[PDB]
Design a protein around this ligand. Structure first.
Ligand code: GTS
Ligand code: GTS
Lengths: 203, 203
């Protein structure tokens, strides 16, 4: 198929799709649209956002939905409904962590941001980190099924962005399991080759 | 199967699962756990939250993941990968609306809440409402595929909760399409029977 991927020049929510395309051996145009050029493309997208994946002229939007689609195409979505459910479930948990951290990161009033951060540090984050540690340990370094799944790609693509929003650059010092899905994805030669060749960003 | 559903005594994020079980003709224990009793059950759940669906003793958490699972079991997830993708995509869009509204609704500082609300009213909500109107019109009163899907159940279950968070009780006056997925779900006799028999709540 003729495949084009459109996202900002950052990893954040789109990198997981890039990593999955690499995994599946799919050649693609990796179109990294700057903030300055984005307004020209915005009204051409399904929801006025990126990422957008284009396959043979047809557009696919919504990062998690795209990852699940690619996951199924590439054999990373389990063998049956129950296995597929578990990946969905655990990725939805990751999304709760991300949404919580984003509520702090994108707060423009610094006094409000400080209050929110402190609240999450006492009432959500300790629970999230222990739960993530449980999941990664139960699954032998993976997000789900004890083995490589599309959930690991979601995790690996957003991990640096999530750490930035949490303001815990050193998270994996206390929780060494947290680097394991990233190592799993990078151990795949096609994926490592794409990462080596790809533009670097902090988030 | 022996099926039990655990959630708070509210519609909010859990009602879509109740509606789907009704659709599929699945008898279930609808266990509405109060805030007062919830701390006893919390550590028995997969992530310290509800909803939780139990099937033959096995627990399933994460509302959207559960809905998609039930959707597939009951023939409401499309006929192929492309159709399934579209439902996922459009439900992920609904989630963006919900997450945005929740950022206002759950703000405890009223001065901050007012600023956030005003910002969303000028910069996100007009776009969300036009996009939702497009989708519902394109799909003949549905969230996806031009026909009944599990996405309609997600929409119908949370609609009153979403309107409460948006502070637009009268939303469907400007946008009459917005009531159509709810009408579609309620036109199914098994679903209407469950709704008639079920406890009522404002959200
Ligand atoms: N639910 C969507 C959210 C996408 C989204 O928020 N995209 C952003 C930026 S990023 O946060 O993902 O980097 C966007 O297009 N922003 C630009 C705009 O809204 O004009 C998804 O998961 O794909
Ligand atoms: N991502 C989860 C979120 C669930 C969630 O936030 N549940 C809440 C309340 S509700 O907002 O959905 O009504 C909960 O259990 N809160 C209780 C607690 O955290 O102790 C899902 O979609 O199921």
């Amino acid at each position: 198929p003729n495949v084009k991927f459109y996202y900002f020049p950052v990893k954040a929510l789109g990198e997981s799709q890039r990593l999955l395309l690499a995994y599946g051996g799919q050649e693609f145009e990796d179109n990294r649209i700057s903030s300055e050029n984005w307004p020209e493309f915005k009204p051409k997208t399904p929801f006025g956002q990126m990422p957008v994946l284009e396959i043979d002229g047809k557009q696919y939007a919504q990062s998690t939905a795209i990852c699940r689609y690619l996951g199924r195409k590439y054999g990373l979505a389990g063998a049956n409904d129950e296995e597929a459910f578990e990946i969905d479930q655990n990725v939805e948990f990751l999304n709760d962590i991300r949404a919580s951290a984003a509520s702090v990161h994108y707060e423009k009033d610094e006094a409000v941001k400080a209050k929110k951060k402190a609240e999450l540090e006492e009432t959500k984050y300790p629970f999230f980190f222990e739960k993530l540690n449980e999941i990664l340990t139960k699954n032998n370094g993976h997000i789900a099924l004890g083995k490589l799944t599309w959930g690991d790609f979601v995790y690996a693509g957003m991990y640096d962005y999530l750490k930035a929003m949490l303001q815990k650059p050193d998270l994996e010092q206390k929780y060494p399991a947290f680097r394991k899905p990233i190592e799993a994805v990078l151990a795949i030669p096609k994926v490592k080759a794409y990462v080596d060749a790809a533009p670097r960003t902090e988030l």
